[PDB]
């Protein structure tokens, strides 16, 4: 694996920080990672889970 | 003309996923959309979604987004195809429940070409069955449809077979190895409450013919490869054969 | 493919010419005209979002435009791009249009919104595609030969090239405020608002609900929609929210550049006749055509000329 | 071809923005004073003057530089190779070889050796540029030596490297009245001109 | 959302009559309609588009009508190949909606089916299972109900059933019903006499059986 | 979004004239029309005319020609402008008749921008009131309404107040200086067949407290800045009070 | 002329019901309609433009339908904020025209009116004048008729009528009427006794008072 | 034709009688379509691309289309010292002259 | 405005032929079609056919 930064907490980059429906729950909280994970390789794994992979429901 | 063809037909366990594929070929037009439409076992007919297979842009109804992936393969990138044009589409259904059971069609859509209008569907493929159920493959019980003293000689009559508690519907059945055809019935299918199938088959006859003339039922199952070609003589508590 | 348009939304930006020589803030403001494809295709970035019907749902029949404080919808049918004369559009996704254009010194893009109002943006832009091969030509020919060139491929499932978005800045609006009874009502309309004053009151602030501020005229006050849930591209035409920005994570952009062959005409055979130690040639150009020649020896000497009409050369 | 990256300009209401440094390949930055930008709904700033705008920009390789690029090479001496047809007693046969005067190739139990040729001339000069099918003798500027608006105004050691040299003479300019844009001045791509 | 409807949910017309299949939308559609047919056991095909234009391969028997909330399909004469399911489709809105299906049926003079009953076989009763069967032959029309009257007790609800469509013989219908039984039930019951009941038939029809013999 | 603001309400002698001024601001669009509509109280809603503030080009419903003029003010707005946009517009109502007494609305009309066609009224001012009559600015008759010969307990009985004989309609009233709130109905207006107004205010009560409670009411009016306060106890041919 | 009409002059219903208001025009306007809501002490606000498009920020509840000469506004389930006056408007020709308007009203259980009456007071009587009041209080529905019936005879040549709407909390109407003359004419009678005729009452009601007490 | 101002209509001559059509289908075109910036009575303002001819036209209420096509050398004079094609975002201001929008 | 003129009335045996003719004048429009219609007094009114006289190019019921 490899580990994301949330604010102080960490989680595996394929996994969500918060679920279900990450952005649809809390836009101004979903800001927190997308502030600063821009330099990290895990950004497009985190983005898929948070915003695109399977329209926040089932499987790709 | 254009032909639409989609691969196979299927039966699968709940919670699994399915991937249908489609070819469109031989049309004179190019940027057309391919759409997927689904028909229940006797309930209605629905648009799921579609794609324009050059762009790979996809559209869905709100019920199927996040259940489904619709996608296509790049056909040719060079500014050519004086050869006949073709495009290939695929649909995935995920986290299946019994109520997702239907026949699925790909169809050609003129919506983008007609000034980015909403769709009307111009050509359809032959359709594919996708079946969701817990039951595994099982061979039939193959009983004679037993006659009795319930009318006796001289009347109108029928002699028959009852096929029970198998799975998949291709228990394709016939009479006298093809030598009989008039006055027959074989029913469509019955979905058993156990998640299995049953079927009724009969030949109508003069009641004097039973237990003296020869009548035979050809139970062939595609699953389990059964071939129960047999005669169906009178036996209810009495005994009889010709 | 690319449902990131869930978070990121269209915007108004300043535009230099809206069809009458006036500038204004426009929903169609051009950001950048990409121009690397040697086949002469343009990739255009624009303030609309095309292919999404609001409610963050992909739909090829519509586009969404920023309408004052919130998105609203219109047809993909009525979008156009025009140079000296109307262009064809060969692909459309998100903030990006592909187009093929006739040669010309200005570019404009526009559409008609749901109310039948029409909007457009115009930039000076020197569209003049570089010649492939050795002949200038104006449409691809019925017969010819193939040469290598480069094109924006039409696949929207793109890769490697990227764009950024930010928490978009406070939107100032003089009509959040109304003046009555010697007081200012701030009306808010379910937005998150900031207000400020010097009106004989110092007590500025955020709000999430309407209120009065007393004993004042509205020009002694200022207000903006101050907080957003949805992101914008970090265009040089919109002010940054903070000294170091925010939300700086990426999004992918469609239509990747790819190598491909295209067809060029072959000029018809010259009529040639031989003299005493020389060749005489008539030439028959349908369009400006390059001639070159060299000696097959230890100096080439070498000359070339473009020709534009029938000539005789010795 | 280079691209110029220009982030959204920061505007400080009611004070100076501090300027700051950054290490990027042709980075330039300014603070402008006495701005009063309007957006569509109103003035953006809370006071009529004493606002400032920070503005900053730098060059990068374009997204296209995977495909639309040209290569500057030094060219050293050459591996001569040859292809030959020979006829004997109605055996019409072909052979392929290096010109090194050894590397004997056998066919139909005949055996062939070729070269080296007496000439040591080659058309390629010591410096060359290649684009696609086209290749040019030209005395291109050494790495880090290239001027604005000419071939090599931006250079990279390899197509994939991030160590962009660039010399575009980018200059930022005063934002126009009432308007939020970032104007600038810069030599157009020396590559696009060379094409 | 938009919702779709027809006046005839099914349409009984003999061959050589004129069809007038008729359609409603629950909201102000304005052209952007189509008509389809589906042959039983086949994929659908397009007949009419916009509202009134027929497709390239389609005989001049068909024509469309109506514009707003209301539409129709006319077939100038019913033909033996044209007996099919028919559908509207709406596309004035993103929710591309099909209109329910409706079936054209050969209208005919009515006739009661002959009734047969069958017990479970010796093979079936040695296999630990049972099902008594009720068979109706050549009914016209098809809206009838069946009941088993076993030991004079009225029953019907625990039955699994199917029907066969209009006959290639004479456009009648044939029907099958089976009663849910464990082995002991067929031995406990003594007399069977299942019946057919309908509005268009003039009285019930039945055949009766003292068990096993 | 956008807003329109217009002159305060006004009162005038018939056969004179009056001008209503409108201002609009803050929308993105540049060249809309501004249009005037009017409404005799609940009796209808009439479009009168408009202008395009860029072109002038005054345009009228034929019913108002001769009885009205419309104008707008052009300004030193540059070809670039670079502000929130603004406009100023007017109706001059002239040769006034008492039937002109109505609320007048300014509204934004998109007709020019929507392909030079007619349009709906997109955004509206507050509306403003024109009153036309010959009457003088009389302050009210403010007498206390006397409760009737009392029906006594076991139910509910009469209690209230009356105001009469004023010009300029905008009076206000208040029981116990706002200490009574619920149970108050105030009947909004009456016209006394010759320019003067009237009002009544009432308090439905159980019969417990006549001649007993300090029921008192304020009356306020704008002419001469007149203000009044009174008790409402039984006094007619005789008296009974707290 | 294009003559407009709104069929319900009023619509009464309880919150959560479908409101549906209907409009006619004497010749085809062919789209070019719009719908507004109007509130007491305000100018109108836009709901729908063309036949069917929601105006800026209008939520979801409202929808517009129709074409040619016939149109409707529907509310999916009426919220307690939506009770208002409502207008159609035409813009097919230079005489832009609004409808007569419709009021949308909270339907509630019935309540009948109570009747009150009041004498003149000393300030009027010193001013040569007498003024007398009649009330109906706090009732629903409101379609009552009233007369002054002084010494049983109709008084009207001096006497006005006034109304108040549904109260926002109580959901009831009320009436006020005044009789006013010279103090010497007010003495011409001895039975000041106003009447009411109403739909929630079983029979007309009256209450009586006498001058000089 | 009833002598009202209207802004949505124009009137033209149909044999011996005045008749009406929409302002919505008026056009002017040099070498490519021009913007029309204001209109009143006999007079039109337009902004037009460089071209050697001018045409003006409209569509009648009968759906008949009419047009007229003079030779006219349209080539706007340069302002300042650069032969620019459309107005930029960034630049200087120079004094010039325009037909004002007013119908006063 | 405009007028159409046409040749005077005809009387004929069955199995004979007729060359009916007309002229148009005074219109501002150049490219109008000319069309022929008929009625018997015991019938409605029917279009037979027409031409655009510049081209020829006849069109018929």
Automatic annotation (TrEMBL), chain A:
Q: Where is the signal peptide?
A: none
Localization terms from the record:
Host Golgi apparatus, Host trans-Golgi network; Host cell membrane; Host cytoplasm; Host endoplasmic reticulum
Highest taxon of the source? Viruses
| Disulfide bond positions | 4-13
Q: Report the function annotation for this chain.
A: Acts as a viroporin that participates in virus glycoprotein processing and transport to the plasma membrane, cell permeabilization and budding of viral particles. Disrupts the calcium homeostasis of the cell, probably at the endoplasmic reticulum level. This leads to cytoplasmic calcium elevation. Because of its lipophilic properties, the 6K protein is postulated to influence the selection of lipids that interact with the transmembrane domains of the glycoproteins, which, in turn, affects the deformability of the bilayer required for the extreme curvature that occurs as budding proceeds. Provides the signal sequence for the translocation of the precursor of protein E3/E2 to the host endoplasmic reticulum. Furin-cleaved E3 remains associated with spike glycoprotein E1 and mediates pH protection of the latter during the transport via the secretory pathway. After virion release from the host cell, the assembly protein E3 is gradually released in the extracellular space.
Cite the record's note on assembly.
Oligomer. Interacts with spike glycoprotein E1. Interacts with spike glycoprotein E2.
Protein name, per record: Structural polyprotein
Task: Specify first residue, last residue and whole-protein length for the fragment.
Answer: 266 to 325 of 1248
Automatic annotation (TrEMBL), chain D:
**Species annotation:** Chikungunya virus (CHIKV)
User: Which cysteines link up through disulfide bonds?
Assistant: 13-45, 14-47
Listed under subunit, the entry gives: Homodimer. Homomultimer. Interacts with host karyopherin KPNA4; this interaction allows the nuclear import of the viral capsid protein. Interacts with spike glycoprotein E2. Interacts with host IRAK1; the interaction leads to inhibition of IRAK1-dependent signaling. The precursor of protein E3/E2 and E1 form a heterodimer shortly after synthesis.
Provide the protein's localization: Host Golgi apparatus, Host trans-Golgi network; Host cell membrane; Host cytoplasm; Host endoplasmic reticulum
Q: What is this protein called?
A: Structural polyprotein
Q: What does this protein do?
A: Provides the signal sequence for the translocation of the precursor of protein E3/E2 to the host endoplasmic reticulum. Furin-cleaved E3 remains associated with spike glycoprotein E1 and mediates pH protection of the latter during the transport via the secretory pathway. After virion release from the host cell, the assembly protein E3 is gradually released in the extracellular space.
Automatic annotation (TrEMBL), chain H:
Coiled-coil residue windows:
none
* Location in the cell: Host Golgi apparatus, Host trans-Golgi network; Host cell membrane; Host cytoplasm; Host endoplasmic reticulum
The chain's disulfide connectivity reads: 34-48
Q: Tell me, how does this one assemble?
A: Homodimer. Homomultimer. Interacts with host karyopherin KPNA4; this interaction allows the nuclear import of the viral capsid protein. Interacts with spike glycoprotein E2. Interacts with host IRAK1; the interaction leads to inhibition of IRAK1-dependent signaling.
What job does this protein perform?
Provides the signal sequence for the translocation of the precursor of protein E3/E2 to the host endoplasmic reticulum. Furin-cleaved E3 remains associated with spike glycoprotein E1 and mediates pH protection of the latter during the transport via the secretory pathway. After virion release from the host cell, the assembly protein E3 is gradually released in the extracellular space. Acts as a viroporin that participates in virus glycoprotein processing and transport to the plasma membrane, cell permeabilization and budding of viral particles. Disrupts the calcium homeostasis of the cell, probably at the endoplasmic reticulum level. This leads to cytoplasmic calcium elevation. Because of its lipophilic properties, the 6K protein is postulated to influence the selection of lipids that interact with the transmembrane domains of the glycoproteins, which, in turn, affects the deformability of the bilayer required for the extreme curvature that occurs as budding proceeds.
- Quote the protein name from its UniProt record: Structural polyprotein
- This protein's species is Chikungunya virus
